[PDB]
Design a protein around this ligand. Sequence first.
Ligand SMILES: *[C@H]1O[C@H](CO)[C@H](O)[C@H](O)[C@H]1NC(C)=O
Ligand SMILES: *[C@H]1O[C@H](CO)[C@H](O)[C@H](O)[C@H]1NC(C)=O
Ligand SMILES: *[C@H]1O[C@H](CO)[C@H](O)[C@H](O)[C@H]1NC(C)=O
Length: 7
Amino acid sequence: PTTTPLK
Ligand SMILES: *[C@H]1O[C@H](CO)[C@H](O)[C@H](O)[C@H]1NC(C)=O
Ligand SMILES: *[C@H]1O[C@H](CO)[C@H](O)[C@H](O)[C@H]1NC(C)=O
Ligand SMILES: *[C@H]1O[C@H](CO)[C@H](O)[C@H](O)[C@H]1NC(C)=O
């Protein structure tokens, strides 16, 4: 699991 560029 990973986090995506929090816009
Ligand atoms: C986050 O990065 C990891 C690294 O292996 C995976 O590619 C995962 O699928 C990524 N998550 C998203 C939402 O792209
Ligand atoms: C996803 O967001 C989290 C929380 O800020 C971390 O910064 C993480 O390094 C991010 N993942 C990517 C691939 O930039
Ligand atoms: C990153 O963006 C993806 C959509 O491509 C998802 O909304 C994911 O939940 C996001 N991650 C964060 C930490 O907001």
